[PDB]
Amino acid sequence: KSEIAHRFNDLGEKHFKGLVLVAFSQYLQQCPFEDHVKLVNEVTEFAKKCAADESAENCDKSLHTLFGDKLCTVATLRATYGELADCCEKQEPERNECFLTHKDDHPNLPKLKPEPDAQCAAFQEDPDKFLGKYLYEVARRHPYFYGPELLFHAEEYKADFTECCPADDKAGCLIPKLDALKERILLSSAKERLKCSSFQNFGERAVKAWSVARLSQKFPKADFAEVSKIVTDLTKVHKECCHGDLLECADDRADLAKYICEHQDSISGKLKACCDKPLLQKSHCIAEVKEDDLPSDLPALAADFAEDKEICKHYKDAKDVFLGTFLYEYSRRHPDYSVSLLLRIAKTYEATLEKCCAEADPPACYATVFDQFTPLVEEPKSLVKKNCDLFEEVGEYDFQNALIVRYTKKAPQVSTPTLVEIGRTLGKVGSRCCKLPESERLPCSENHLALALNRLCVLHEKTPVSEKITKCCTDSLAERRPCFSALELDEGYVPKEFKAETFTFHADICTLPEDEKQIKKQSALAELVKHKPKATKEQLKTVLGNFSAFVAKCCGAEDKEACFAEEGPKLVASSQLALA
Ligand SMILES: N[C@@H](C(=O)N[C@@H]1C(=O)N2C(C(=O)O)=C(Cl)CS[C@H]12)c1ccccc1
Ligand SMILES: N[C@@H](C(=O)N[C@@H]1C(=O)N2C(C(=O)O)=C(Cl)CS[C@H]12)c1ccccc1
């Protein structure tokens, strides 16, 4: 009867309020903390009133009508979010559709900063205000963050301030932890953003196909029907979360977790760990569970998929089932492949049956289908080996620099802070993946590459600048990474006009923390590439080498700024001659 009561009953007040703050922050990314809170309280109050009397006036309205309505009463809508007030003219579902277009993927809000001093004070003060504020901060910053996962991370962020506010050194305990937690927030956010981008750009069928491959890898002992079932449920969960229906999403998620834990023996023996846990933790653990060992009765695939004479007839009768089965079987035995490579492999299998089934003697044509996969596998494997050899040899910073040079040549129209952010995120993929056991390297690098490329595509929908990037971002999810790998120097780019100020440094760079000093160097690297796109990577590396020596030198000078002023213009002119 009352959907609001229903969710309030299912989730409990703590989690309901939490999720509703997340939904509100992400949707209305600008408001102070306390105005989101007042709206959360109003909605929560209304929920309690409905739970006690479901036939109460307004109680039977959809969540969307309810929350859309709330959102549209906020102070100063046409001044904070001028395009957003227009949304308020529309009914549901159009209203919510309108609201979602408006979500902003790069609000570039102040950087989140651990002040172990002032924060610890506020936490001892009112721990509930403190968590709320954290949820609020994250959500507005990552408007698509997996709702129920944010509540998990809030518990973590809380358990940190616990262990570290009593401690002798406040930042001592706390800065590494909050540093770690940031990374996991960014990774988590990038995983979910890929899911919502897949429903947005490619649809539900692509999301299901991705999840079939990935879940078959993780639960290779489960049967097909059990994988389908979980993929069906999981897909609905993320479809809801990506649509801002965080309450339904959380509720369906807990139902999923409970289903998976009641059937753990026919799913995976890695789950027992997860299933012995509390709610949020249990779900988190299932979502991140490692791949089970392979069963020793995995069937030989040739028989059903290459040799059987009725293949074309099972294909023509039931394409989606037949291809799903192939996907499930091939993926469960290839935890050493990336999800996208599995999907590419499934699409080549499909394409081969389309072709062979329309010639005189199909079995003779499709007999070799598994043999056509060999080049598909070898291209990403050797790409991963080349990038990990380079990483191992030059280390992270130079590996970022090499990727910055590579991506700026592919897309020199992209703004400098995006090129640096992506080259840096892709170099951290090396550090994360290159050190793993070698059979883990390929899925690690390729899966994480999908995340960084999709961040590039999300930004590019906001601010399109390149037709080649559009085409890679929108043609096919599974082909993205090879479509990017194949871009080269955009050959009718016109070198960006030289601007001496861009390459001019001052003493301020001397007080920067290490990574901010690197970002300043790596931005001038990408600018060197924009002005001399034909320069070889070996020339750029030399000139950047000269810029760093010049910075180290001037930051050690008695008079930092005279050194910058005296030496800079020489270096800036002679660099251009070196990049010819
Ligand atoms: N124990 C609560 C909690 O600390 N909630 C914080 C707190 O309380 N917050 C409030 C509030 O009551 O003002 C809102 Cl609006 C929603 S939740 C946030 C909790 C909720 C979700 C996950 C973990 C803890
Ligand atoms: N008939 C094709 C097909 O339409 N593929 C389209 C294809 O392309 N899509 C993508 C993609 O963008 O990479 C995925 Cl994940 C699979 S479906 C969709 C198909 C291939 C594999 C499974 C089902 C359908």
DSSP string of 151-197? HHHHHHHHHHHHHHSSSSSHHHHHHHHHHHHHHHHHHHHHHHHHHHH
Per DSSP, the residues of 476-543 read: -TTTHHHHHHH----TT---PPP-GGGG---GGGGGS-HHHHHHHHHHHHHHHHHH-TTS-HHHHHHH
How far, in Å, CA of 180 to CA of 203, rounded?
Answer: 33
* Burial category of 128 from C-beta neighbours within 10 Å (exposed 0-12, middle 13-18, buried 19 and up): exposed
Q: Give, using CA atoms, the residue closest to atom 8 of ligand 1.
A: 128
Query: With contact defined as beta carbons under 8 Å apart, do 8 and 47 qualify?
Result: yes
Helix (H) or strand (E) run with residue 121 in it: helix 116-125
d(CA 396, CA 1): 57
DSSP string, 379-444: HHHHHHHHHHHHHHHHHHHHHHHHHHHHHHHH-TTS-HHHHHHHHHHHHHHHHHHHTS-GGGHHHH
Residue numbering of the annotated binding site for (4Z,15Z)-bilirubin IXalpha: 236
The answer to whether 63 and 245 have CB atoms below 8 angstroms apart is yes
> Of 370, 405, 371, 388, which Cα lies nearest the Cα of 446?
388
Contact 143, 104 (CB under 8 A): yes
3-state secondary structure of 142: coil
Q: Which two tokens stand for residue 515?
A: 């990574």
The encoded tokens of residue 519 equal 């970002």
Q: Which ligand minimizes its atom distance to the CA of 159?
A: 1
CA dihedral 541, 543, 544, 549 (to 10 degrees): 120
The upper half-sphere exposure of residue 418, i.e. CA atoms within 13 Å in the direction of its Cβ, equals 22
- The residue written with tokens 């993320």 in the block is 238
Residues 22, 26, 27, 32: what is their CA dihedral angle, to the nearest 10 degrees?
80
What long-range pairs does 541-546 form, CB within 8 A, spacing at least 24? 541/398, 541/401, 542/578, 543/575, 543/578, 543/579, 544/401, 546/571, 546/575, 546/578
CA-closest residue to ligand 1 atom 4: 128
The token pair at 355 is 């072709």
Q: Give the E-state strand segments of 60-113 in sequence order.
A: none
Binding residue ranges: 3, 10, 64, 236, 240, 243, 245, 248, 251, 255
Choose which residue among 11, 14, 160 to substitute to test ligand 1 binding: the one with the highest number of ligand atoms within 8 A of its C-beta. 14
Q: 451 by DSSP, 3-state: which?
A: helix
CB contact at 8 A, 474 and 505: no
Distance separating alpha carbons of residues 146 and 138, to the nearest angstrom: 11
Structure method = X-ray
For residue 571, how far is the Cα from the chain centroid?
39
Q: Residue 115: CA atoms inside 13 Å, Cβ hemisphere, count?
A: 9
Residues 6 or more apart in contact with residue 120 via CB below 8 angstroms: 161, 164, 165, 170, 174
Distances (CA, A) of 561 to 305, 500, 508, 549, 557: 71, 17, 9, 15, 8
- Helix, strand or coil for residue 473? helix
| 3 state SS of 137 | helix
507: left (phi over 0), alpha (psi -120 to 50) or beta: alpha
Q: Which amino acid is at 88?
A: C
Under 8 Å between Cβ of 300 and 406: no
Helix axes 3-11, 246-262, angle to 10 degrees: 50
Closest CA to 203 of 229, 157, 242: 242
Query: Residues near 374 by Cβ (< 8 Å), separated by ≥ 6?
Result: none
Mapping DSSP to helix (H, G, I), strand (E, B) and coil, where does residue 88 land? Answer: helix
CA of 200 to the centre of ligand 2 (A): 15
- Provide CB contacts within 8 A for 515, sequence distance 6+: none
Q: Please write down the HEC assignment for all residues of 13-39.
A: HHHHHHHHHHHHHHHCCCCCHHHHHHH
CA–CA distance, 47 with 118 (Å, rounded to integer): 34
**135 touches 112 (CB < 8 A):** no
Q: Residue 378 burial (CB < 10 Å; 0-12/13-18/19+)?
A: exposed
Write out the two tokens for 86: 């227009």
28 and 103 Cβ atoms separated by less than 8 Å: no
Q: What residue owns the CA closest to ligand 1's atom 5?
A: 128
Query: Quick one: tokens of 263?
Result: 């059937």
Q: Can you tell me the distance from the alpha carbon of 328 to that of 112, in angstroms, rounded to the nearest whole number?
A: 41
Residue 435, CA distances (Å) to 184, 377, 380, 394 in order: 18, 21, 17, 14
Peptide bond into 116 cis (omega under 30): no
- For 208-258, the three-class secondary structure string (H helix, E strand, C coil) is HHHHHHHHHHHCCCCCHHHHHHHHHHHHHHHHHHHCCCHHHHHHHHHHHHH
Sign of the torsion formed by the C-alpha atoms of 284, 290, 295 and 299: positive
Cβ–Cβ under 8 Å, residues 432 and 550: no
Contact by Cβ (8 Å): 282, 154: no
On whether the CB atoms of residues 444 and 391 are closer than 8 A, the answer is no
Is-contact 17 40, C-beta < 8 A?
A: yes
DSSP assignment, residue 352? H
Separation of CA 188 and ligand 2 centre (Å) = 25
**Residue whose C-alpha is closest to residue 244's, from 451, 29, 459, 440:** 29
Measured distance CA(235)–CA(253) in Å, rounded: 10
Q: How far apart are CA 406 and CA 300, in angstroms?
A: 42
What's at 157, amino acid-wise? Y
Annotated binding site for Ca(2+): 3, 10, 240, 245, 248, 251
Joined tokens for residue 129: 């205000």
Q: Going from the N-terminus, what domains does the chain have, and what CATH number goes with each?
A: 3-102 (1.10.246.10), 116-199 (1.10.246.10), 200-288 (1.10.246.10), 301-379 (1.10.246.10), 380-486 (1.10.246.10), 500-578 (1.10.246.10)
Closest ligand to C-alpha of residue 473 is: 2
Please list, in sequence order, all residues whose beta carbon lies within 8 angstroms of the beta carbon of residue 458, skipping any fewer than 6 positions away: 105, 193, 197
Identify whether the C-beta of residue 235 lies closer than 8 Å to the C-beta of residue 196: no
Answer for the pair 356, 366: CB distance below 8 angstroms, yes or no: yes
Distance CA 95, CA 59 (A): 19
Which residue, by CA, sits nearest to atom 9 of ligand 1?
Answer: 132
